[PDB]
Amino acid sequence: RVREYSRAELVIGTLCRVRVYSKRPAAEVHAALEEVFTLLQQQEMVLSANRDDSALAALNAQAGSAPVVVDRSLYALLERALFFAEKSGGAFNPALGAVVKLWNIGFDAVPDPDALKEALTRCDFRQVHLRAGVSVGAPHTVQLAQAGMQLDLGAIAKGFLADKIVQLLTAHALDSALVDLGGNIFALGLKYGAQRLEWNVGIRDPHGTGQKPALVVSVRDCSVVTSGAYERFFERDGVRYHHIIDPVTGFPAHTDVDSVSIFAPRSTDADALATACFVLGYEKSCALLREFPGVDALFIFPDKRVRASAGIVDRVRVLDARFVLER
Ligand SMILES: Nc1ncnc2c1ncn2[C@@H]1O[C@H](COP(=O)(O)OP(=O)(O)O)[C@@H](O)[C@H]1O
Numbered sequence: 001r002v003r004e005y006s007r008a009e010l011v012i013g014t015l016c017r018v019r020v021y022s023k024r025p026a027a028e029v030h031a032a033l034e035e036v037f038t039l040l041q042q043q044e045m046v047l048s049a050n051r052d053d054s055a056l057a058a059l060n061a062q063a064g065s066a067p068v069v070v071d072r073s074l075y076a077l078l079e080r081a082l083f084f085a086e087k088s089g090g091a092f093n094p095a096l097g098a099v100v101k102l103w104n105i106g107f108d109a110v111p112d113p114d115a116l117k118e119a120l121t122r123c124d125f126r127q128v129h130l131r132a133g134v135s136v137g138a139p140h141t142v143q144l145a146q147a148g149m150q151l152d153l154g155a156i157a158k159g160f161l162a163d164k165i166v167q168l169l170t171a172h173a174l175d176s177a178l179v180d181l182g183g184n185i186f187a188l189g190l191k192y193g194a195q196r197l198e199w200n201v202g203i204r205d206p207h208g209t210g211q212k213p214a215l216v217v218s219v220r221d222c223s224v225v226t227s228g229a230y231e232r233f234f235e236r237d238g239v240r241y242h243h244i245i246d247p248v249t250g251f252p253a254h255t256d257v258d259s260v261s262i263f264a265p266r267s268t269d270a271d272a273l274a275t276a277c278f279v280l281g282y283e284k285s286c287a288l289l290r291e292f293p294g295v296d297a298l299f300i301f302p303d304k305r306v307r308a309s310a311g312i313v314d315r316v317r318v319l320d321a322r323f324v325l326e327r
């Protein structure tokens with residue numbers, strides 16, 4: 001008997017839901033889901049920026065001092081984040097904490113011009129030194145060379161966690177699932193109905209209440225992560241300030257797309273690239289994405305035109321006829 005299971009909780013500061021189809025005994029699926037959400041709870045205390053408690057916060061507290069020992073997994077995440085910092089030319093920047101914290105208070109007024117200029121001197125991700133010994137049991141260490149520099153993994157954390165969850169589900173012999181971490185999707189395998197079908201993931205209207213999808217894409221074994229100008233913002237004197245920062249200016253990025261969705265085998269990659277591509281804009285995004293052949297992208301423009309890379313365009317269906325899919 002094929003059974004369908006779902007579970008959701010408020011965790012890592014958002015609503016996380018996993019949906020599973022399985023013929024394994026219910027007890028086994030329940031065990032897997034129990035562990036998925038235990039993982040998420042534990043990982044919140046490792047990765048969460050703005051905590052005091054988290055490993056990340058402790059790491060930030062040691063900026064400008066001695067190397068700090070970290071678990072293999074946090075290390076691996078940092079390696080990847082720096083990787084995308086280099087490839088994207090800093091558009092995605094995991095060492096942007098000093099600036100983000102200044103805007104984080106705004107949500108609760110615009111930062112001061114110089115204060116902002118000052119924070120940016122403390123965002124050189126190239127000053128993040130990762131070192132790992134090669135001998136049996138050698139430790140993994142991180143050193144923030146520049147004083148005042150603060151790590152913030154908010155733009156790659158969900159992807160990292162979705163990949164961890166997929167590993168977990170797979171470890172429990174589950175091969176059909178839809179992982180949703182606050183809009184960060186991973187579609188594992190196929191769902192059940194033509195019997196076995198691709199998952200249908202909706203992309204919201206960037207200006208929409210998010211109750212209905214503008215588009216829907218069919219995918220298997222794939223992450224779908226969207227970066228929008230309206231996922232999170234505050235308004236002051238007629239001006240909207242969204243959460244995604246352009247590290248050159250220190251202000252919310254001004255770009256020629258309303259949203260960019262990345263489709264990748266790894267959600268970690270999809271999450272970082274989605275953020276980078278938003279900051280870069282359409283043309284520079286296309287250039288960067290050519291260096292990642294196994295990745296696909298979907299851009300929604302302010303005039304409601306939609307462009308999709310060759311890998312997914314055939315799998316895209318428009319639900320809101322105000323939008324047009326260019327071929
Ligand atoms: N240019 C950037 N590079 C990396 N991280 C960023 C950047 N700008 C903002 N951030 C951090 O990442 C978060 C946004 O990441 P993103 O993945 O685009 O959105 P979401 O949080 O919805 O996944 C912000 O809340 C901020 O803390």
Ligand SMILES: [Mg+2]
Pocket residue numbers: 154155156227270271272273274275
């Ligand atoms: Mg991101």
Ligand SMILES: [Mg+2]
Pocket residue numbers: 154155156157158159184225271
């Ligand atoms: Mg993200």
